Symmetry: D4
Subunit: 215 residues, 8 copies
């Protein structure tokens, strides 16, 4: 089978949006989009789920040492070889107010991740090739009813509206494929951040189409 690694944040993990913000649980394996992707691709594909809630592209979060995507991705790639394609959907967490990042800064973080994929051939001690990479801008954020989410994401809705543009430009320069998740879904979870069951279905179906076309 061809092997597809989905690297991302809570949107990849499958965070169930709740009115009280947190804590929550994971969408069922056949409901979260990575599962819908697996189902739509079929049994000659294997999907590997590497979504970590709150993960950023390449910035340390002072509240939690686990969340720097670029710190983890090289080790993850070498763990999962052989791989055919890595889907990277990140950037939503980088738009939190405390990071004070512009859309460019976020695209630069994404560029680091893209380069990690492109330079991954061989892993540790193998003959395996580098996978391809698909850069995915997350859908724009929506208004958030929970006061804490409103606070931590101040300015974030605005910055997420620019990610499709800056990620498309980056992908074009780096000669790697791009897909805008916002082109097929809006962020419809009750919290303004996460995905509904239908959001997950629609993105999984859309990404299966992208994956088939790329391989």
């Amino acid at each position: 089978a061809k092997r597809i690694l989905c690297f991302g944040d809570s949107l990849t993990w499958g965070w169930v949006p709740v009115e009280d913000g947190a804590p929550t649980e994971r969408f069922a394996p056949d409901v979260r989009w990575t599962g819908v992707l697996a189902q739509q691709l079929g049994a000659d594909f294997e999907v590997i789920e590497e979504g970590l809630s709150a993960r950023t592209t390449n910035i340390d979060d002072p509240t939690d040492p686990r969340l720097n995507g670029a710190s983890y991705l090289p080790s993850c790639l070498a763990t999962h070889l052989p791989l055919d394609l890595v889907i990277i959907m990140l950037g939503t967490n980088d738009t939190k107010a405390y990071f004070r990042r512009t859309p460019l800064d976020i695209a630069l973080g994404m560029s680091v991740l893209v380069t990690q994929v492109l330079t991954s051939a061989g892993g540790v001690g193998t003959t395996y090739p580098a996978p391809k990479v698909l850069v995915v801008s997350p859908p724009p954020l929506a208004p958030m009813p929970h006061p804490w989410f409103q606070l931590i994401f101040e300015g974030g809705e605005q910055k997420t509206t620019e990610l499709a543009r800056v990620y498309s430009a980056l992908a074009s320069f780096m000669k790697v494929p791009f897909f805008d998740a916002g082109s097929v879904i809006s962020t419809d979870g009750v919290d303004g951040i996460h995905f509904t069951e239908a959001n997950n279905r629609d993105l999984g179906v859309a990404l299966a189409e992208q994956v088939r076309s790329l391989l």
Copy 2:
């Protein structure tokens, strides 16, 4: 299904032993012991493969920044919740000559990993409990025909022979389960380090029994 994360090194990844040392490829999904484990346990269980070749317990390798297990594990656990059990088989790489580690130093690295599993409840924003842990000593190393492996593993065999004892002592102190892989297989790969198809099968069958006893 109950979820089992197998955190380890090349022995968990499925490195195919070769006479010329490296490079190599991965054992087929149903051949490597993690796949044997999955097949033996059947559909009431799910296995997650997190084996990274050359990984250590908790020591940076000056040749490769990807290999410190303890740097990666917390992020891995939070990625994969919900989990029921983490099987950790590490320590072989720590016995390389260049690390100058004693069996105690290696057991201390394992202790860090055990604590990371025991303190993992909730992950990022969830209601999930911590998984159980199973500490696994790898089998003793064997004579290595390739001169580079002989060099990098000088003194290593003797240290691997002590890991069942030090890990059992650690596990008893921390009140967590222990299993010695060396109690069911010898290291029979042609390189003196990695596993044959039969080694993989025997370990997968043995670990399935261990999993059933714990979950």
Copy 3:
């Protein structure tokens, strides 16, 4: 007896406000609010005083390496187990001009401390549970007659007026108790920063009621 850890800054230590700014002394053990709290609760409770003047939530002070609350709290918690409750009143120092922090930044520092309490079960080698936590916003700052305090707290009053709102939002999200010190006292010390004897009395009496409600 139930053990209550009071983790804070000079307002917890008991700094006596003086017209010449500094130096000063500590309020007497029966006058500072932690002592009032102890007296009001009686012998079924033991109050542990951990107030360090000038302490911040989680930011290094360039003038003094002792003042990062988050650097100290985990060691403090493991020292003081068994614990039933940790009361945290911090954020006033974070509002000093030189830190250039917003109310959100300060609430994020508070979030780090909350998580350190919530994840403290066991300490070093024990069977003890984590304590509960009570997040306390300090009262707003008041006019300051001393020229140096005027300088270092420029913009601070306005930030302290926002802390009840941002800490309440945080506590709600994290599902932990919140209390606003500003709901029972104003900052009445002559320096515009610290507490009078009556401020200490009133806060100690109010907090005893909070403690009894939680334990």
Copy 4:
């Protein structure tokens, strides 16, 4: 009342020794030696308990970031002013095999702590003087039935036999008070490391005499 800070490790915290090593609980407040000390001294004195299990003099423990005594002590001293005396009993953990420390190295660690006490006058913004210091060597370790404790303390029984000598030499050089806990008790806990109820009583009574002599 005169204020006495007891800075130490699990022997100050009051670890209850057990046959199975860990986990355990704390001796009751009236049983641990810091409580005995307080009772023996009476109302003219106040005892502050700052014992952290596994704490070293001044060395980072790779397994736990909380354990470097010298990292914490300056903040602790400024927290607890006004102080009349600091009793420091540390060095047992420094004798663990993995630290590879000699008795001299351990005494040098103690020297750092002594200097932190001697240089602590004023704290943050106060008129208080520096407290006196009392350097205390812990009793020699004893045979340990638990295999993990045997492993981690290999060579440590021997090193602990030398601490009275090297600490006495240090304290003489630094012109500060010294007391050997081994002059009054042997390590009689079932694990070979920690104190019995009677050890706690005997040491508390002995230290009360030392405090009265100094204050």
Copy 5:
């Protein structure tokens, strides 16, 4: 022959401008300005090419650890002794938006490099003198059709326009030779950043005159 080291970025390496941004190749050795310089100077001179694409004066690039000029230059000078002149043309990369540098900041980076050249006498174990230095401001950037170049260089056109003035002031203060590449060429490459064949020729001819005037 007198030896001339040309230390720079892609403008010194000889990056061929392309409409799709990247990837590209190097201008031929007789076409890039360092080769024109060598040809124009003739046999009494020797040119050493040390241009690294994307290199900055003295600032780490978060996307690529190879790019800090000041990290490399001292090792490079000691490698190439004996030297008569070092031509330094850098600053263009420093004007990328993500570095948030002012013309002054960039001139201060150039100052570090100048001092590295001035203090280079002897290298490792030699009797050789320091070379002279020639500070060169790059020409102003121009409009960039590629959306990714436009993004990463936002604000850069404006900052590059100031480099001749700030570098001239620096060089005057430091009492070292200065030349403005913008005095003889405009940035005519199709991407708005790199040099055409004619730009290379004109700059090489001009720099040959500067070299003869200094050596």
Copy 6:
């Protein structure tokens, strides 16, 4: 004799202002103000000159690792015991544009140096007392004809007009002596930054009066 340490920057070293900016020489020992101070005090005082050109209060200069005053002062104090008084005149370099410091930031740097003086009793192995400290604001800067000095000091003329205010407030709070050099001289050097012969004489005479009054 009483021992007076003069800790400062180029204005303490005795930089001779020159129209061409740099390089320069030092004023003669009887002309620089530290020499005038010595003469005025007489031979029952010993003046120790510790002026380092370009030194800041407590901020690293990216162009030169020698220039952080606070990195050097504790070692300097311990070198020169016994000492009666330390005169600190710093802050001019902190006003350089690249540091992006406010007058408050610079006063906070000064506070670190004051504390280092006040906590210096005993040095290494001695019985000697801490010296007193005299905080001195440098005179305001003047117009600078040299384009490099104009560049690096942009915004600094205005900041230096504020140092007397912020340093007087700091000194008042810390209960240490203050003197404004601007109260007796203007910056009359041809470069707008450094002192003329008369500026040196007038400041030395004034500081001798201050020293006598303080001891």
Copy 7:
């Protein structure tokens, strides 16, 4: 022409051995082995000289920050693309007594450099492939008359005798070419470390044959 980068230490730079140890000069361009190599190969090849005296494989020298080969090589490769072959001769400096390195440690450093070459495709923004690599063990060291060289190289002659073996093993494992300089020359310089004119000729001739076999 095909481009050959010679990455090395003083043996590549062309250090002229002298009886007084240091300082010295460089062998003439037609005498040092890199120039003999160029002459032997002729105009279809281009030799790039990157030898830095005292350079180590991958270890910082406490006396000189310029000397870590692995710190410099990635930047050097990207500078000099396009490249066809990198010849690496290093390890002599790693045998200095102060580094306390074994032959394995030195071969591990070499491994880092080999990996840097193998992973160098593309450089910064190019279409160029990775060059091939040739690992070269230096000849064994000889007796040294200068007392300082005797001191700093104590144990080094014995370690250098082992480098051909360990480098051969490493090269075999990594599936890259290997050549032992010691197979064609002995270290005949008067200082017991550096090369004579004839040593340079013989190695240049031998390495030209090696190059012709690879390209």
Copy 8:
């Protein structure tokens, strides 16, 4: 007057030996050897005293951050220009048992200091040349009655006896002046470490001769 910087440790500061080890005071200005040197040389020379008790050549002391000679020297040299000669007597503290240094390691630290002096021309913004250097081995240590000194200097008598040999070899290689203090005095202080009045006189007279011979 020519300016002579005496850079050293307690032997340069003028530590008065005492039977109780520490604390002590400084020898009077005309009794410590730097003052003897000044009196002997007379008014055409100016001696600058830069002796810091416990200073090492270039190693951090874990007990005291002030003691790394190499961290301080470059800033000191630039402070004290113009300079004619730097006399460096260091290495005694590096022989303390806890540093685990060999004589070679200490000579390498001295080499760093020598290079700092040799490369000091110009300082910050000046026209001044580098001073000359004189490398001075301290005399051999002697038997020590104080138990703390016996402990911390274990192995030091042997190592200090080697310093004249290794420093002479170093100075010869580096082509700089060397003088052995042990050629004119023995360490006659009652503590076995520091100098008597006569030791000071004898060394000061000897060094005056060395200074005149070099200048």
